[PDB]
Design a protein around this nucleic acid. Structure first.
Ligand SMILES: Nc1ncnc2c1ncn2[C@@H]1O[C@H](COP(=O)(O)OP(=O)(O)NP(=O)(O)O)[C@@H](O)[C@H]1O
Ligand SMILES: Nc1ncnc2c1ncn2[C@@H]1O[C@H](COP(=O)(O)OP(=O)(O)NP(=O)(O)O)[C@@H](O)[C@H]1O
Lengths: 265, 661, 663
DNA sequence: ATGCCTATAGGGCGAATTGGGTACCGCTGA
DNA sequence: TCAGCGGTACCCAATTCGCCCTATAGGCAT
């Protein structure tokens, strides 16, 4: 977990385990000094906070490397319990778990050398937040760089405008090009949006975030299958631009090609 | 069923001032109707049996159709005597506790009325014990104590950071920032107009992002129109106006798709203004210089004769190049160079070795160290046709530029309306963006006074605070019309009290409110109390506050004892529950007042529960039905930095005090 | 002899930051040495057994000569972690209560030091329960609370009215008002320099009336010099300078008669620059136009070539005499005046009463307030030929106007010195006026800490009040080193408190002090308390740790908290601390009559109170400090005097005696 | 070996920003 | 009245600070 973005990914995964519908991510100095995530999901007990300090083991890993302070209020009316670094004491927070981080590299000057600038690594933090937001429209995500909110991703209810938030996540130009693709072949169920190949910009073509069971998966062959379908529409061969949610493996890929091709054409 | 009512009226250059008195009851009122019809309506409303007017009253037409008229001298309406006489009548050292102190126009009438009252009656009038200011505009009545405490535009320090302004003021244009600021100091209470904003804001929530960039192109058109009216406008000001004119077609298109009749009404108020945009494009260069003084403002193709006088100033470099070439050929001097000098004009410079080899036609103009500069008749003649043509073309530029005011002023009124509408759009679109960003809800207005907040939050404190605000519910009604809020410091007493005040004010700018859900009733006067004086402001709130008024009492009883403050707070809370029944929030440290809910009807015990574990403490920041458990200054003292060694003595001192009580 | 001291140092683009820690005692200090030699001296002074430095520390030469040196990474000196770690160490929610919060440069050192400190000894640090700033400048120490509370330049509201500034600021010249304002924000404590002011002020009290009018002629010469240096000065700015230059002989004459060596030194520093006076008198017209852009600035006879380009303008000058007269005759309007404008050219301005009496030949050019400017073809034709040749005169007039800087820039340094000296003269003549007017006394400075005031008064409150202040004395020494001041609400217990603070501050601007007689000792730090616990006790925490034996403590309405048992208990401990441990000069304005049992408990403390006589519901405050305690509560009696309804007052007195029957 | 990918740091450009310049505001003795 | 006349608020506009970006190398699994 050398990249601050990879740490962010782990903390959001812990917020998804809580089942939080509200995520707020705080970043200081390119995301190195502060990584505060507050969540409204299940609140781990003061005992569950103590063993997580000592998914709990993954929290212990960041606590040893950095001075991670985690405060969680239990569903049972109670003071939230805030575990620094290794001190656990009462705190004020609504029902849920908050995962604050001090300089990620408290004991690693090599990991500081591994940090790439302050903005490019934040752009990597943005990318991770950009990918999980698509997978989970249900959970609100508010992103702030150096304490300045950059992106306002809004929790979408079932039947709500997933496209609006999708448009916010990947930019308006993607949404315009994006054609809603929902293909079900027997048990295999595909839902999402694929950008129109002819007028697709290179930046939209780079955005090809494929989610299998709400987990981001990149396969060159799956890309090649969508790229083939893009090459079938028109002679020019541009990078495939597809955001999809599929529940399924190689026979599927044959019907990811046909399923996408039929909607595209 | 009529009464014998006495009154007075006076005016200055600004507006009108009014006062009344019933000798049967002893009621005394004050007002400042700004316009004529309001003033005529107020005379018509009160209908005084006896009316006073100053010998030099300008707008006599108001009073020449009234009964029991009295012509009074001017000096009687002087504010100096007025303040002095009224202070000694009420026995106060100031009229701040009537909320009339900063209403001198009206106090001229009141001052003249009382001097006349002390002369008409000439008996003891202790049945006159108070005056009150009642400017019952669609605007909320707020003392500057609210505006300095709520930090609407100005924080306690005097800065404009951590304000409700700073938060809501993400407005792209400055004239939007100002209209936002006026709204927040003048909350609209025409429930229809408020709903017109709430429906507008709901519709633009989606389209907010697309409109904002287009609005940032406009700039401060409102202040440009102020310079346009004065005929003192600058070319770059007119460029910003043209840049704004080009956006009106784009905005008319974006707002056409938006489903909201108020938006469609605002879209019509905005206007196409294509003809004014076309004239500015044809006339002015895309980016002209700062002043018209310099010229180079009006683009070629607008005026033929401008381009004629320009054509003289454009036939220059080639003329001198041919001269430079011809004179270099004829004389045989290759260092001969014809250049311009801002001080002396155009010259012919030759190197010092070749300077005295020049012919007899060359007249000495400038002697240099490395050269000798000259002037000749052809240049000197050419120098005249340039210098004059510049000035005449430039003079025509100033005249045309003034003529452009004659073409724009016909629409000036319509441009101000459009500018106000554009400024209003920026505010609305900004508020729609903030509501979209900060997940704000639309509060719906009811008939009876009361605020029902569902998991509501402090709109400013939540933004700048690193930790999330703990959501706070409120249930105010004429049944639960007061809440005794006790607890610790950093309990959230003042936050939950000031969060309620902002919520009301943010609801009464038609903007989406910082809560999950709010249902609010008529709040006509928002009044707040905070330490720098104390008794002065509380009295103004007692005298002015009605059944409908929102009262925000913060620690009444910062006085000179345990009991002076408690006794007063008890009487004030009783008064506002027993007599006035105003919407009152009484956040105080007086746990003794927690015996009011059992004493009074309408009062309810609430507190900010704080649970102390180890030496440190946790404040739930959550409003619970009950009272403060104990003292917390000891717990806070450490959190303020104080050495624990002094607390170990202070806790021991508290233990001795606990044994007594 | 030898100490085991841990220390750290860091610098930014602005200056240096420094911190230390002794593991033997637990003293934890911080500083921001601005310059290099101060920073070298501080390392040399402390002599730490172990010293931290950032890998990218620029000025290494400082630390190449110290022992036990440690090379640390940059990230450790980050303020974010520093604030977080130090908050957790002390258990505070902010470092405002150490008075170091607004010293981030040093807190980088402190932050890096503690992270290292918690790790070097790896022991419990309960003895290290506070950090404190030791200012590299040991002249004066003024926190924001003091400036906002004593109201030196800014009242409680934020206005600059009824301040110590507003009172003392009767300065004739604006550059004097600013030098007065800087002095108040930087009270001098070089006893020599203070006495240099006190001797100057004493000598000028007599000559103040003669000099003030001469100083008012000068105007803000300092801001004119700022524009002259930028080469952006205006003719009417140069006219004020010429007007000021004409006064220098007059000022040199009036200050010559004054017997004060500092005045005679200031008189020599003042200079004359009568050469530069001669230059401007010859160069510029007596009363020139607003801007140089217009021209018509430089008087004829200075530059001949300006006169050659103005040969047309010389013919043009009596052409405007001939057009103004002809048009004054023809129209019949005597207020008709012909003047120049860079934007429009030459115009004909007529007074508003006579504006509409002008003929139809007159075309509207400029509309003004109480005037209407016009244009006619003859003038508009004449305007063109003049604009161009007079333009080459104006370009030369602007070129000669720049050359006026080239003739003034040799003395520019000396003019700034002179301007500062003239500004200083205005301040010290202004103070000499105020002291003469208000019969202020010269306080004499002693070596030991303490203020001995004889019938002293509040310098601001006495001016704004409609009643002559009841002047009262003060006897502060390291024997009588504390006063517990009890009294009524709006009683005026905070006056004698605040009057003491101003007296010290007014004494430390070398100005004559508001009292009959004062003898004052070293007061380096002024620490103040005024209401609005999350804001109030944060200041009280800062005044406790920072305050020394010499520091002047002004706590007002302390313990306004969650009860009468929390506020008292803290107030009791604070009063004990400042009398028992610190033994600091403290002025404790409070309502806690229970604390009146501290003069018998503590050594140094004295009971005082503000006499107030109440008859019925109305009350009179004597505003006179008497040695004792407040008889009872008066908020009832005041409440009516504030205007609160008698229904509340009666119910207050009816509820009072139901509560007073218990206690 | 190696060859397509990838972050990077200096450079370029835009957005805030406070000093600097202008139009405006009383206004002040004469 | 009155003609400057110095002040004063406030709107620019070059400057400063932060943000972006494209050639410039490296880079690491194959
Ligand atoms: N709902 C809240 N959620 C989180 N922090 C809060 C909340 N309300 C108040 N605070 C914190 O409490 C402090 C503000 O004090 P506040 O609660 O407004 O005054 P108080 O309780 O009356 N104390 P005092 O001013 O001394 O009389 C700050 O540290 C806030 O961050
Ligand atoms: N001699 C005096 N005559 C008349 N008024 C005075 C006199 N001395 C002081 N005052 C004023 O009396 C008022 C009382 O002081 P003020 O600060 O308002 O109350 P306090 O009790 O001193 N302060 P506090 O402890 O915070 O309640 C102020 O307006 C003083 O300026």
């Amino acid at each position: 977990v050398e990249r601050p973005a990879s740490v962010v990914k782990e903390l959001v995964e812990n917020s998804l385990d809580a089942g939080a519908t509200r995520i707020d991510i705080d970043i200081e100095r390119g995301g190195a000094k502060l990584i505060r995530i507050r969540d409204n999901g299940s609140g781990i007990k003061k005992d569950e906070l103590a063993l997580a300090l000592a998914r709990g083991e993954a929290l212990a890993s960041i606590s040893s490397v950095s001075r991670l302070t985690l405060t969680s209020r239990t569903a049972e009316q109670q003071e939230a319990w805030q575990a620094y670094a290794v001190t656990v004491k009462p705190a004020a927070h609504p029902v849920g778990t908050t995962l604050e981080v001090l300089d990620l590299f408290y004991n690693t000057p090599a990991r500081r050398k591994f940090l790439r600038t302050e903005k490019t690594e934040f752009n990597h933090i943005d990318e991770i937040i950009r990918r999980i937001a698509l997978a989970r429209f249900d959970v609100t995500i508010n992103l702030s760089h150096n304490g300045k909110i950059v992106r306002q991703y809004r929790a979408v209810p079932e039947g709500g405008q997933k496209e609006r938030r999708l448009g916010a996540i990947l930019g308006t130009a993607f949404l315009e090009q994006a054609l809603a693709i929902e293909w079900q072949h027997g048990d295999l169920t595909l839902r999402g949006w694929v950008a129109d190949p002819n007028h697709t910009t290179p930046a939209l073509a780079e955005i090809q975030y494929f989610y299998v069971n709400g987990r981001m998966m990149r396969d060159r062959l799956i890309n090649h299958a969508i790229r083939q379908a893009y090459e079938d529409k028109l002679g020019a061969d541009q990078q495939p631009a597809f955001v999809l949610y599929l529940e399924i493996s190689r026979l599927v890929h044959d019907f990811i090609y046909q399923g996408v091709l039929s909607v595209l054409q | 069923r009529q009464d014998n009512l006495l009154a007075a009226i006076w005016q200055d250059s600004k507006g009108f001032g009014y006062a009344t008195l019933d000798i049967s009851s002893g009621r005394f009122r004050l007002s400042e109707p700004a316009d004529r019809e309001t003033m005529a309506a107020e005379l018509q409303r009160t209908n005084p049996a006896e009316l006073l007017y100053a010998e030099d009253f300008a707008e006599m037409s108001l009073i020449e159709g009234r009964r029991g008229l009295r012509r009074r001298p001017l000096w009687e309406f002087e504010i100096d005597t007025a303040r002095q006489q009224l202070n000694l009548q009420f026995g106060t050292r100031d009229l701040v506790g009537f909320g009339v102190e900063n209403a001198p126009r009206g106090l001229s009438a009141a001052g003249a009325l009382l001097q006349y009252a002390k002369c008409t009656q000439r008996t003891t009038l202790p049945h006159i014990r108070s005056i009150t200011m009642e400017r019952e505009q669609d605007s909320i009545i707020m003392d500057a104590a609210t505006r300095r405490n709520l930090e609407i535009t100005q924080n306690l320090a005097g800065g404009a950071e951590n304000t409700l302004a700073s938060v809501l003021d993400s407005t792209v244009t400055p004239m939007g920032s100002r209209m936002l600021k006026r709204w927040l100091h003048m909350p609209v209470r025409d429930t229809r107009v408020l709903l017109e904003r709430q429906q507008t804001i709901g519709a633009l929530q989606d389209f907010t992002a697309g409109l904002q960039p287009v609005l940032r192109q406009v700039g401060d058109l409102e202040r440009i129109l102020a310079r346009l009216a004065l005929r003192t406008a600058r070319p770059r000001d007119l460029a910003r106006m043209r840049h704004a004119f080009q956006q009106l077609p784009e905005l008319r298109a974006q707002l056409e798709t938006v489903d909201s009749a108020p938006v469609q009404a605002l879209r019509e108020k905005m206007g196409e203004f294509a003809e004014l945009r076309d004239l500015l494009e044809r006339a002015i260069i895309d980016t002209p210089p700062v002043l018209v003084r310099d010229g180079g403002v009006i683009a070629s193709g607008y005026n033929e004769e401008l381009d004629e006088w320009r054509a003289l100033a454009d036939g220059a470099t080639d003329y001198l190049e041919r001269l430079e070439v011809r004179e270099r050929e004829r004389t045989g001097l290759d260092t001969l160079k014809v250049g311009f000098n801002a001080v002396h004009g155009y010259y012919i410079q030759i190197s010092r070795g070749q300077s005295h080899l020049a012919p007899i036609n060359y007249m000495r103009r400038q002697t240099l160290k490395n050269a000798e500069r000259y002037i000749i008749p052809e240049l000197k003649e050419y120098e005249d046709k340039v210098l004059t043509s510049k000035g005449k073309a430039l003079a025509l530029e100033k005249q045309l530029y003034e003529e452009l005011f004659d073409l724009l002023l016909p629409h000036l009124e319509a441009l101000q309306q459009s500018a106000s509408a554009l400024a209003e759009l920026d505010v609305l679109v900004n508020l729609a963006e903030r509501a979209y960003t900060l997940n704000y809800t639309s509060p719906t207005f009811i008939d009876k006074p009361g605020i029902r907040i569902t998991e509501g939050r402090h709109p400013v404190v939540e933004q700048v605070l690193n930790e999330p605000f703990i959501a706070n519910p409120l249930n105010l009604s004429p049944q639960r019309r007061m809440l005794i809020i006790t607890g610790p410091n950093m309990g959230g007493k003042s936050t939950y009290m000031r969060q309620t005040a902002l919520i009301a004010l943010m609801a009464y700018i038609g903007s989406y409110v910082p809560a999950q859900k709010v249902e609010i009733g008529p709040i006509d006067r928002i009044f707040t109390r905070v330490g720098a004086v104390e008794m002065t402001e509380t009295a103004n709130i007692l005298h002015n506050a009605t059944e409908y008024s929102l009262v925000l009492m913060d620690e009444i009883g910062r006085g000179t004892s345990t009991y002076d403050g408690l006794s007063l707070a008890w009487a004030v809370a009783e008064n506002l529950a027993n007599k006035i029944k105003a919407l009152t929030l009484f956040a105080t440290h007086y746990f003794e007042l927690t015996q009011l809910p059992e004493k009074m009807e309408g009062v309810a015990n609430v507190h900010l529960d704080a649970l102390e574990h180890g030496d440190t403490i946790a404040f739930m920041h959550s409003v619970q039905d009950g009272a403060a458990s104990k003292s917390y200054g000891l717990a806070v003292a450490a959190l303020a930095g104080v050495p624990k060694e002094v607390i170990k003595r202070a806790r021991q001192k508290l233990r001795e005090l606990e044994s007594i009580s």
